[PDB]
């Protein structure tokens, strides 16, 4: 199912994410397509700045979700 | 070696720091001295916010260096 991770100035990472998916797994799915390693990926979604080892369900990330990505 | 970790809000935290000091090690010495826990602190040198496990030697933060501490 798709998520739209939006990297700052507009670079929108369309990712196919699993029903099983996890946040370091999603960082690996970004480290593909965008080439960005996990420290340099700081994600933001719904109230929360995100970490590394959590699920997508934890943060309430679902189908057609806009996440934001902060580089650094 | 003596550095001046200021806040923008008036305060100067005068610290004897190491050439081996990483930023969280300086943040731990700020936790000791002024009571502030680690990832509440953000260190600025000049106008750049710092990465974590890099040293004061890497950044060239030597003696008499004024750093600026903000909280977020």
Short mmCIF file of N, CA, C and O in Angstrom, two decimals:
data_model
loop_
_atom_site.label_atom_id
_atom_site.label_comp_id
_atom_site.label_asym_id
_atom_site.label_seq_id
_atom_site.Cartn_x
_atom_site.Cartn_y
_atom_site.Cartn_z
N UNK A 1 0.85 -1.22 0.00
CA UNK A 1 0.00 0.00 0.00
C UNK A 1 0.87 1.24 0.00
O UNK A 1 1.99 1.20 0.49
N UNK A 2 0.42 2.38 -0.56
CA UNK A 2 1.35 3.46 -0.80
C UNK A 2 1.47 4.42 0.38
O UNK A 2 0.52 4.71 1.09
N UNK A 3 2.68 4.94 0.62
CA UNK A 3 2.86 6.14 1.42
C UNK A 3 3.64 7.17 0.62
O UNK A 3 4.45 6.86 -0.25
N UNK A 4 3.37 8.45 0.91
CA UNK A 4 3.98 9.59 0.25
C UNK A 4 4.89 10.28 1.24
O UNK A 4 4.46 11.16 1.99
N UNK A 5 6.18 9.92 1.29
CA UNK A 5 7.12 10.56 2.19
C UNK A 5 7.66 11.82 1.54
O UNK A 5 8.27 11.77 0.48
N UNK A 6 7.41 13.01 2.11
CA UNK A 6 7.77 14.25 1.46
C UNK A 6 9.05 14.83 2.02
O UNK A 6 9.12 15.32 3.15
N UNK A 7 10.12 14.78 1.21
CA UNK A 7 11.42 15.32 1.57
C UNK A 7 11.46 16.81 1.31
O UNK A 7 11.60 17.27 0.18
N UNK A 8 11.34 17.59 2.41
CA UNK A 8 11.49 19.03 2.54
C UNK A 8 11.04 19.94 1.40
O UNK A 8 9.94 20.50 1.42
N UNK A 9 11.88 20.14 0.37
CA UNK A 9 11.64 21.07 -0.73
C UNK A 9 10.73 20.52 -1.81
O UNK A 9 10.40 21.23 -2.76
N UNK A 10 10.26 19.26 -1.69
CA UNK A 10 9.19 18.74 -2.55
C UNK A 10 9.43 17.37 -3.10
O UNK A 10 8.56 16.78 -3.74
N UNK A 11 10.62 16.79 -2.85
CA UNK A 11 11.00 15.47 -3.35
C UNK A 11 10.18 14.37 -2.68
O UNK A 11 10.43 13.95 -1.55
N UNK A 12 9.11 13.93 -3.36
CA UNK A 12 8.11 13.04 -2.78
C UNK A 12 8.43 11.60 -3.06
O UNK A 12 8.34 11.10 -4.18
N UNK A 13 8.80 10.86 -2.00
CA UNK A 13 9.16 9.47 -2.05
C UNK A 13 7.90 8.62 -1.99
O UNK A 13 7.35 8.35 -0.93
N UNK A 14 7.39 8.19 -3.15
CA UNK A 14 6.31 7.21 -3.20
C UNK A 14 6.82 5.81 -2.89
O UNK A 14 7.65 5.26 -3.61
N UNK A 15 6.38 5.22 -1.77
CA UNK A 15 6.85 3.91 -1.35
C UNK A 15 5.69 2.96 -1.29
O UNK A 15 4.63 3.31 -0.78
N UNK A 16 5.88 1.71 -1.75
CA UNK A 16 4.97 0.62 -1.46
C UNK A 16 5.37 0.04 -0.12
O UNK A 16 6.48 -0.48 0.05
N UNK A 17 4.51 0.17 0.90
CA UNK A 17 4.74 -0.36 2.23
C UNK A 17 3.81 -1.52 2.52
O UNK A 17 2.70 -1.64 2.00
N UNK A 18 4.29 -2.42 3.38
CA UNK A 18 3.67 -3.68 3.71
C UNK A 18 2.54 -3.53 4.74
O UNK A 18 2.44 -2.49 5.40
N UNK A 19 1.67 -4.51 4.97
CA UNK A 19 0.82 -4.52 6.16
C UNK A 19 1.61 -4.90 7.41
O UNK A 19 1.10 -4.75 8.52
N UNK A 20 2.84 -5.42 7.24
CA UNK A 20 3.76 -5.83 8.28
C UNK A 20 4.80 -4.78 8.60
O UNK A 20 5.63 -4.98 9.48
N UNK A 21 4.79 -3.63 7.90
CA UNK A 21 5.94 -2.75 7.80
C UNK A 21 6.40 -2.06 9.08
O UNK A 21 5.64 -1.74 10.00
N UNK A 22 7.71 -1.79 9.12
CA UNK A 22 8.41 -1.23 10.26
C UNK A 22 9.23 -0.04 9.81
O UNK A 22 9.40 0.23 8.62
N UNK A 23 9.70 0.80 10.74
CA UNK A 23 10.20 2.12 10.40
C UNK A 23 11.63 2.11 9.90
O UNK A 23 11.96 2.86 8.98
N UNK A 24 12.50 1.23 10.40
CA UNK A 24 13.84 1.01 9.86
C UNK A 24 13.79 0.25 8.54
O UNK A 24 14.59 0.50 7.63
N UNK A 25 12.80 -0.64 8.37
CA UNK A 25 12.40 -1.24 7.09
C UNK A 25 11.98 -0.17 6.08
O UNK A 25 12.52 -0.09 4.98
N UNK A 26 11.05 0.74 6.42
CA UNK A 26 10.74 1.92 5.60
C UNK A 26 11.94 2.82 5.33
O UNK A 26 12.12 3.29 4.21
N UNK A 27 12.84 3.05 6.31
CA UNK A 27 14.12 3.69 6.05
C UNK A 27 14.99 2.95 5.04
O UNK A 27 15.61 3.57 4.18
N UNK A 28 15.03 1.61 5.06
CA UNK A 28 15.67 0.80 4.04
C UNK A 28 15.02 0.95 2.66
O UNK A 28 15.71 1.09 1.65
N UNK A 29 13.67 1.00 2.59
CA UNK A 29 12.90 1.31 1.38
C UNK A 29 13.13 2.73 0.84
O UNK A 29 12.92 3.00 -0.34
N UNK A 30 13.59 3.68 1.67
CA UNK A 30 14.06 5.00 1.25
C UNK A 30 15.53 4.97 0.84
O UNK A 30 15.96 5.61 -0.11
N UNK A 31 16.37 4.18 1.55
CA UNK A 31 17.79 4.00 1.29
C UNK A 31 18.09 3.32 -0.05
O UNK A 31 19.18 3.46 -0.61
N UNK A 32 17.09 2.61 -0.60
CA UNK A 32 16.94 2.24 -2.00
C UNK A 32 16.81 3.52 -2.87
O UNK A 32 17.76 4.27 -3.08
N UNK A 33 15.60 3.79 -3.38
CA UNK A 33 15.13 4.91 -4.17
C UNK A 33 15.77 6.29 -4.01
O UNK A 33 15.98 7.00 -5.00
N UNK A 34 16.07 6.74 -2.78
CA UNK A 34 16.64 8.05 -2.51
C UNK A 34 18.11 7.99 -2.09
O UNK A 34 18.82 8.99 -2.14
N UNK A 35 18.61 6.82 -1.63
CA UNK A 35 20.00 6.64 -1.22
C UNK A 35 20.38 7.16 0.15
O UNK A 35 21.56 7.30 0.48
N UNK A 36 19.40 7.48 1.01
CA UNK A 36 19.65 8.20 2.25
C UNK A 36 19.87 7.25 3.44
O UNK A 36 18.99 6.43 3.70
N UNK A 37 20.96 7.25 4.21
CA UNK A 37 21.15 6.30 5.31
C UNK A 37 20.34 6.64 6.58
O UNK A 37 19.82 7.76 6.65
N UNK A 38 20.19 5.77 7.60
CA UNK A 38 19.13 5.93 8.60
C UNK A 38 19.24 7.08 9.58
O UNK A 38 18.21 7.53 10.07
N UNK A 39 20.45 7.59 9.89
CA UNK A 39 20.63 8.75 10.76
C UNK A 39 20.20 10.02 10.03
O UNK A 39 19.56 10.92 10.56
N UNK A 40 20.55 10.08 8.74
CA UNK A 40 20.28 11.20 7.86
C UNK A 40 18.79 11.31 7.57
O UNK A 40 18.29 12.40 7.31
N UNK A 41 18.06 10.19 7.66
CA UNK A 41 16.61 10.17 7.64
C UNK A 41 15.96 10.45 9.00
O UNK A 41 15.87 9.58 9.86
N UNK A 42 15.42 11.66 9.21
CA UNK A 42 14.56 11.94 10.34
C UNK A 42 13.13 12.13 9.86
O UNK A 42 12.77 13.18 9.31
N UNK A 43 12.26 11.12 10.02
CA UNK A 43 10.88 11.20 9.56
C UNK A 43 9.99 11.94 10.56
O UNK A 43 10.24 11.97 11.76
N UNK A 44 8.90 12.57 10.08
CA UNK A 44 7.89 13.21 10.92
C UNK A 44 6.51 12.73 10.47
O UNK A 44 6.19 12.73 9.28
N UNK A 45 5.65 12.31 11.42
CA UNK A 45 4.28 11.94 11.12
C UNK A 45 3.36 12.09 12.34
O UNK A 45 3.63 11.57 13.42
N UNK A 46 2.21 12.77 12.13
CA UNK A 46 1.09 12.93 13.06
C UNK A 46 1.45 13.09 14.54
O UNK A 46 1.45 12.13 15.31
N UNK A 47 1.82 14.32 14.94
CA UNK A 47 2.22 14.65 16.31
C UNK A 47 3.66 14.33 16.64
O UNK A 47 4.25 14.91 17.53
N UNK A 48 4.25 13.34 15.94
CA UNK A 48 5.49 12.73 16.34
C UNK A 48 6.59 12.98 15.33
O UNK A 48 6.40 12.86 14.12
N UNK A 49 7.82 13.29 15.81
CA UNK A 49 9.02 13.03 15.04
C UNK A 49 9.36 11.57 15.27
O UNK A 49 9.24 11.08 16.38
N UNK A 50 9.73 10.83 14.21
CA UNK A 50 9.87 9.40 14.30
C UNK A 50 11.30 8.98 14.59
O UNK A 50 12.26 9.75 14.40
N UNK A 51 11.46 7.75 15.09
CA UNK A 51 12.71 7.17 15.54
C UNK A 51 13.29 6.25 14.45
O UNK A 51 13.46 6.65 13.30
N UNK A 52 13.59 4.99 14.83
CA UNK A 52 14.11 3.95 13.96
C UNK A 52 13.29 2.68 14.15
O UNK A 52 12.44 2.36 13.33
N UNK A 53 13.49 1.92 15.25
CA UNK A 53 12.83 0.62 15.43
C UNK A 53 11.44 0.67 16.02
O UNK A 53 11.25 0.35 17.19
N UNK A 54 10.44 1.05 15.22
CA UNK A 54 9.03 0.99 15.57
C UNK A 54 8.26 0.40 14.40
O UNK A 54 8.79 0.23 13.31
N UNK A 55 6.95 0.09 14.57
CA UNK A 55 6.12 -0.35 13.44
C UNK A 55 5.47 0.83 12.74
O UNK A 55 5.47 1.96 13.23
N UNK A 56 4.85 0.62 11.57
CA UNK A 56 4.00 1.65 10.98
C UNK A 56 2.69 1.82 11.74
O UNK A 56 2.17 2.93 11.90
N UNK A 57 2.13 0.72 12.29
CA UNK A 57 0.92 0.72 13.10
C UNK A 57 1.03 1.51 14.40
O UNK A 57 0.10 2.25 14.73
N UNK A 58 2.17 1.45 15.11
CA UNK A 58 2.57 2.26 16.27
C UNK A 58 2.25 3.74 16.08
O UNK A 58 1.51 4.39 16.82
N UNK A 59 2.78 4.31 14.99
CA UNK A 59 2.64 5.71 14.68
C UNK A 59 1.32 6.10 14.02
O UNK A 59 1.07 7.30 13.86
N UNK A 60 0.50 5.09 13.66
CA UNK A 60 -0.74 5.15 12.90
C UNK A 60 -0.52 5.53 11.43
O UNK A 60 -1.23 6.34 10.84
N UNK A 61 0.50 4.92 10.80
CA UNK A 61 0.80 5.10 9.39
C UNK A 61 0.06 4.04 8.59
O UNK A 61 0.14 2.84 8.86
N UNK A 62 -0.73 4.47 7.60
CA UNK A 62 -1.63 3.62 6.87
C UNK A 62 -1.44 3.79 5.37
O UNK A 62 -0.53 4.47 4.91
N UNK A 63 -2.39 3.26 4.55
CA UNK A 63 -2.50 3.60 3.14
C UNK A 63 -2.67 5.09 2.87
O UNK A 63 -3.38 5.78 3.61
N UNK A 64 -2.03 5.57 1.80
CA UNK A 64 -2.02 6.91 1.25
C UNK A 64 -1.62 7.99 2.24
O UNK A 64 -2.07 9.14 2.23
N UNK A 65 -0.69 7.64 3.16
CA UNK A 65 -0.25 8.54 4.21
C UNK A 65 0.79 9.52 3.71
O UNK A 65 1.76 9.15 3.06
N UNK A 66 0.64 10.81 4.05
CA UNK A 66 1.72 11.77 3.87
C UNK A 66 2.60 11.75 5.09
O UNK A 66 2.17 12.15 6.17
N UNK A 67 3.86 11.31 4.95
CA UNK A 67 4.88 11.49 5.97
C UNK A 67 5.74 12.65 5.51
O UNK A 67 5.74 13.00 4.33
N UNK A 68 6.53 13.27 6.40
CA UNK A 68 7.55 14.22 5.98
C UNK A 68 8.91 13.65 6.31
O UNK A 68 9.07 12.95 7.31
N UNK A 69 9.93 13.93 5.48
CA UNK A 69 11.31 13.55 5.77
C UNK A 69 12.16 14.78 5.95
O UNK A 69 12.21 15.66 5.09
N UNK A 70 12.87 14.88 7.09
CA UNK A 70 13.85 15.91 7.35
C UNK A 70 15.24 15.30 7.22
O UNK A 70 15.55 14.27 7.81
N UNK A 71 16.11 15.93 6.40
CA UNK A 71 17.45 15.45 6.15
C UNK A 71 18.44 15.99 7.17
O UNK A 71 18.47 17.19 7.46
N UNK A 72 19.27 15.11 7.77
CA UNK A 72 20.18 15.49 8.84
C UNK A 72 20.32 14.40 9.90
O UNK A 72 21.13 13.48 9.76
N UNK B 1 40.20 22.20 28.40
CA UNK B 1 40.29 23.54 27.76
C UNK B 1 38.97 24.29 27.84
O UNK B 1 37.91 23.71 27.70
N UNK B 2 39.01 25.61 28.10
CA UNK B 2 37.82 26.33 28.50
C UNK B 2 37.00 26.85 27.32
O UNK B 2 37.51 27.57 26.47
N UNK B 3 35.71 26.47 27.25
CA UNK B 3 34.77 26.99 26.27
C UNK B 3 33.60 27.67 26.96
O UNK B 3 33.30 27.44 28.13
N UNK B 4 32.90 28.53 26.21
CA UNK B 4 31.77 29.28 26.72
C UNK B 4 30.51 28.79 26.04
O UNK B 4 30.16 29.23 24.94
N UNK B 5 29.75 27.87 26.65
CA UNK B 5 28.48 27.44 26.08
C UNK B 5 27.41 28.41 26.54
O UNK B 5 26.92 28.37 27.66
N UNK B 6 27.01 29.36 25.69
CA UNK B 6 25.97 30.29 26.04
C UNK B 6 24.61 29.71 25.75
O UNK B 6 24.46 28.82 24.93
N UNK B 7 23.56 30.23 26.40
CA UNK B 7 22.23 30.18 25.80
C UNK B 7 21.99 31.54 25.18
O UNK B 7 22.61 32.54 25.55
N UNK B 8 21.04 31.63 24.23
CA UNK B 8 20.57 32.91 23.70
C UNK B 8 19.88 33.72 24.80
O UNK B 8 20.00 34.94 24.90
N UNK B 9 19.18 33.02 25.70
CA UNK B 9 18.56 33.54 26.91
C UNK B 9 19.55 33.87 28.02
O UNK B 9 19.45 33.40 29.16
N UNK B 10 20.54 34.73 27.74
CA UNK B 10 21.41 35.33 28.75
C UNK B 10 22.58 34.50 29.22
O UNK B 10 23.72 34.95 29.18
N UNK B 11 22.32 33.27 29.70
CA UNK B 11 23.23 32.40 30.43
C UNK B 11 24.55 32.08 29.71
O UNK B 11 24.59 31.92 28.49
N UNK B 12 25.68 32.02 30.44
CA UNK B 12 26.94 31.50 29.93
C UNK B 12 27.31 30.32 30.80
O UNK B 12 27.48 30.47 32.00
N UNK B 13 27.43 29.12 30.21
CA UNK B 13 27.88 27.92 30.89
C UNK B 13 29.36 27.74 30.55
O UNK B 13 29.73 27.25 29.48
N UNK B 14 30.25 28.19 31.44
CA UNK B 14 31.69 28.09 31.22
C UNK B 14 32.19 26.70 31.58
O UNK B 14 32.11 26.29 32.74
N UNK B 15 32.68 25.94 30.60
CA UNK B 15 33.05 24.55 30.79
C UNK B 15 34.50 24.30 30.43
O UNK B 15 34.99 24.75 29.39
N UNK B 16 35.22 23.51 31.26
CA UNK B 16 36.48 22.90 30.88
C UNK B 16 36.19 21.61 30.13
O UNK B 16 35.75 20.62 30.70
N UNK B 17 36.38 21.62 28.80
CA UNK B 17 36.09 20.49 27.93
C UNK B 17 37.35 19.82 27.43
O UNK B 17 38.46 20.36 27.50
N UNK B 18 37.21 18.60 26.91
CA UNK B 18 38.27 17.77 26.41
C UNK B 18 38.47 17.95 24.91
O UNK B 18 37.58 18.45 24.22
N UNK B 19 39.58 17.54 24.29
CA UNK B 19 39.64 17.39 22.84
C UNK B 19 38.91 16.13 22.38
O UNK B 19 38.65 15.99 21.19
N UNK B 20 38.60 15.20 23.30
CA UNK B 20 37.91 13.94 23.09
C UNK B 20 36.40 14.06 23.21
O UNK B 20 35.68 13.16 22.78
N UNK B 21 35.88 15.18 23.76
CA UNK B 21 34.47 15.43 23.94
C UNK B 21 33.63 15.32 22.66
O UNK B 21 33.82 16.08 21.71
N UNK B 22 32.67 14.37 22.64
CA UNK B 22 31.57 14.37 21.68
C UNK B 22 30.47 15.26 22.21
O UNK B 22 30.50 15.72 23.35
N UNK B 23 29.44 15.57 21.40
CA UNK B 23 28.48 16.59 21.80
C UNK B 23 27.58 16.14 22.93
O UNK B 23 27.39 16.87 23.89
N UNK B 24 27.08 14.89 22.92
CA UNK B 24 26.37 14.29 24.03
C UNK B 24 27.18 14.17 25.32
O UNK B 24 26.63 14.19 26.42
N UNK B 25 28.53 14.11 25.23
CA UNK B 25 29.42 14.15 26.38
C UNK B 25 29.45 15.56 26.99
O UNK B 25 29.33 15.75 28.20
N UNK B 26 29.51 16.61 26.14
CA UNK B 26 29.31 18.00 26.54
C UNK B 26 27.90 18.24 27.09
O UNK B 26 27.73 18.85 28.14
N UNK B 27 26.85 17.70 26.44
CA UNK B 27 25.48 17.72 26.95
C UNK B 27 25.32 17.05 28.31
O UNK B 27 24.57 17.53 29.15
N UNK B 28 26.03 15.94 28.58
CA UNK B 28 26.10 15.31 29.88
C UNK B 28 26.75 16.19 30.95
O UNK B 28 26.29 16.26 32.08
N UNK B 29 27.81 16.93 30.59
CA UNK B 29 28.44 17.93 31.45
C UNK B 29 27.55 19.16 31.67
O UNK B 29 27.56 19.78 32.73
N UNK B 30 26.70 19.53 30.70
CA UNK B 30 25.64 20.52 30.86
C UNK B 30 24.49 19.98 31.74
O UNK B 30 23.90 20.72 32.52
N UNK B 31 24.18 18.67 31.66
CA UNK B 31 23.24 18.00 32.54
C UNK B 31 23.68 18.00 34.00
O UNK B 31 22.90 18.33 34.88
N UNK B 32 24.96 17.66 34.26
CA UNK B 32 25.64 17.82 35.54
C UNK B 32 25.55 19.26 36.06
O UNK B 32 24.93 19.57 37.07
N UNK B 33 26.15 20.20 35.31
CA UNK B 33 26.25 21.59 35.69
C UNK B 33 24.91 22.33 35.80
O UNK B 33 24.64 22.96 36.83
N UNK B 34 24.06 22.35 34.76
CA UNK B 34 22.87 23.19 34.73
C UNK B 34 21.56 22.41 34.76
O UNK B 34 20.48 23.01 34.75
N UNK B 35 21.58 21.06 34.82
CA UNK B 35 20.38 20.25 35.03
C UNK B 35 19.55 19.95 33.80
O UNK B 35 18.37 19.63 33.91
N UNK B 36 20.12 20.03 32.59
CA UNK B 36 19.38 19.85 31.35
C UNK B 36 19.62 18.47 30.72
O UNK B 36 20.77 18.18 30.38
N UNK B 37 18.66 17.57 30.52
CA UNK B 37 18.93 16.26 29.91
C UNK B 37 19.35 16.30 28.43
O UNK B 37 19.16 17.35 27.82
N UNK B 38 19.88 15.22 27.81
CA UNK B 38 20.54 15.31 26.50
C UNK B 38 19.72 15.80 25.32
O UNK B 38 19.95 16.92 24.90
N UNK B 39 18.77 15.03 24.74
CA UNK B 39 18.11 15.41 23.49
C UNK B 39 17.05 16.52 23.67
O UNK B 39 16.26 16.84 22.79
N UNK B 40 17.04 17.20 24.83
CA UNK B 40 16.37 18.48 24.99
C UNK B 40 17.26 19.61 24.51
O UNK B 40 16.78 20.69 24.16
N UNK B 41 18.59 19.40 24.50
CA UNK B 41 19.59 20.38 24.13
C UNK B 41 19.92 20.33 22.65
O UNK B 41 19.99 19.27 22.04
N UNK B 42 20.15 21.50 22.02
CA UNK B 42 20.71 21.58 20.68
C UNK B 42 21.85 22.59 20.65
O UNK B 42 21.66 23.79 20.85
N UNK B 43 23.08 22.12 20.39
CA UNK B 43 24.25 22.98 20.31
C UNK B 43 24.43 23.57 18.91
O UNK B 43 24.43 22.86 17.90
N UNK B 44 24.61 24.90 18.84
CA UNK B 44 24.97 25.68 17.67
C UNK B 44 26.42 26.13 17.79
O UNK B 44 26.83 26.69 18.80
N UNK B 45 27.24 25.93 16.74
CA UNK B 45 28.53 26.58 16.60
C UNK B 45 28.43 27.53 15.42
O UNK B 45 28.06 27.12 14.31
N UNK B 46 28.70 28.83 15.64
CA UNK B 46 28.49 29.91 14.68
C UNK B 46 27.03 30.06 14.25
O UNK B 46 26.25 30.79 14.85
N UNK B 47 26.62 29.33 13.19
CA UNK B 47 25.22 29.24 12.76
C UNK B 47 24.85 27.85 12.33
O UNK B 47 23.80 27.64 11.73
N UNK B 48 25.69 26.83 12.62
CA UNK B 48 25.39 25.46 12.27
C UNK B 48 24.99 24.69 13.52
O UNK B 48 25.69 24.74 14.54
N UNK B 49 23.89 23.91 13.48
CA UNK B 49 23.58 22.97 14.54
C UNK B 49 24.37 21.68 14.36
O UNK B 49 24.64 21.23 13.24
N UNK B 50 24.85 21.12 15.46
CA UNK B 50 25.81 20.04 15.44
C UNK B 50 25.17 18.67 15.30
O UNK B 50 24.03 18.43 15.71
N UNK B 51 25.91 17.72 14.70
CA UNK B 51 25.65 16.31 14.78
C UNK B 51 26.19 15.80 16.11
O UNK B 51 26.98 16.47 16.78
N UNK B 52 25.76 14.60 16.51
CA UNK B 52 26.00 13.97 17.78
C UNK B 52 27.43 13.47 18.03
O UNK B 52 28.28 14.17 18.57
N UNK B 53 27.74 12.21 17.62
CA UNK B 53 29.01 11.54 17.89
C UNK B 53 30.20 12.00 17.09
O UNK B 53 31.02 11.20 16.65
N UNK B 54 30.33 13.32 16.92
CA UNK B 54 31.46 14.00 16.36
C UNK B 54 32.11 14.79 17.48
O UNK B 54 31.44 15.22 18.42
N UNK B 55 33.43 14.98 17.45
CA UNK B 55 34.14 15.59 18.57
C UNK B 55 34.27 17.09 18.46
O UNK B 55 34.14 17.70 17.40
N UNK B 56 34.61 17.77 19.57
CA UNK B 56 35.00 19.17 19.56
C UNK B 56 36.26 19.43 18.74
O UNK B 56 36.41 20.47 18.12
N UNK B 57 37.17 18.44 18.67
CA UNK B 57 38.33 18.47 17.78
C UNK B 57 37.97 18.43 16.30
O UNK B 57 38.50 19.23 15.54
N UNK B 58 37.03 17.55 15.87
CA UNK B 58 36.44 17.50 14.53
C UNK B 58 35.85 18.86 14.10
O UNK B 58 36.19 19.43 13.06
N UNK B 59 34.99 19.46 14.94
CA UNK B 59 34.42 20.77 14.66
C UNK B 59 35.37 21.96 14.78
O UNK B 59 35.00 23.08 14.43
N UNK B 60 36.60 21.76 15.30
CA UNK B 60 37.56 22.80 15.65
C UNK B 60 37.02 23.77 16.72
O UNK B 60 37.23 24.98 16.69
N UNK B 61 36.34 23.22 17.74
CA UNK B 61 35.88 23.94 18.91
C UNK B 61 36.98 23.85 19.95
O UNK B 61 37.05 22.95 20.78
N UNK B 62 37.93 24.80 19.89
CA UNK B 62 39.05 24.87 20.81
C UNK B 62 38.76 25.84 21.95
O UNK B 62 37.61 26.19 22.22
N UNK B 63 39.80 26.30 22.67
CA UNK B 63 39.63 27.20 23.80
C UNK B 63 39.08 28.57 23.43
O UNK B 63 39.24 29.04 22.30
N UNK B 64 38.35 29.20 24.37
CA UNK B 64 37.63 30.46 24.22
C UNK B 64 36.44 30.42 23.26
O UNK B 64 35.74 31.41 23.04
N UNK B 65 36.13 29.24 22.68
CA UNK B 65 35.02 29.09 21.75
C UNK B 65 33.66 29.33 22.37
O UNK B 65 33.27 28.69 23.35
N UNK B 66 32.89 30.25 21.78
CA UNK B 66 31.52 30.50 22.20
C UNK B 66 30.57 29.62 21.41
O UNK B 66 30.43 29.76 20.20
N UNK B 67 29.90 28.68 22.09
CA UNK B 67 28.83 27.89 21.51
C UNK B 67 27.51 28.50 21.94
O UNK B 67 27.44 29.20 22.94
N UNK B 68 26.42 28.24 21.19
CA UNK B 68 25.09 28.67 21.58
C UNK B 68 24.18 27.48 21.73
O UNK B 68 23.92 26.73 20.79
N UNK B 69 23.67 27.26 22.94
CA UNK B 69 22.74 26.22 23.31
C UNK B 69 21.31 26.73 23.19
O UNK B 69 20.93 27.75 23.78
N UNK B 70 20.47 26.02 22.43
CA UNK B 70 19.03 26.23 22.41
C UNK B 70 18.37 24.94 22.84
O UNK B 70 19.03 23.91 22.98
N UNK B 71 17.05 24.95 23.08
CA UNK B 71 16.34 23.76 23.54
C UNK B 71 15.21 23.42 22.58
O UNK B 71 14.31 24.23 22.36
N UNK B 72 15.22 22.20 22.00
CA UNK B 72 14.16 21.67 21.17
C UNK B 72 14.42 20.19 20.81
O UNK B 72 15.34 19.89 20.01
#
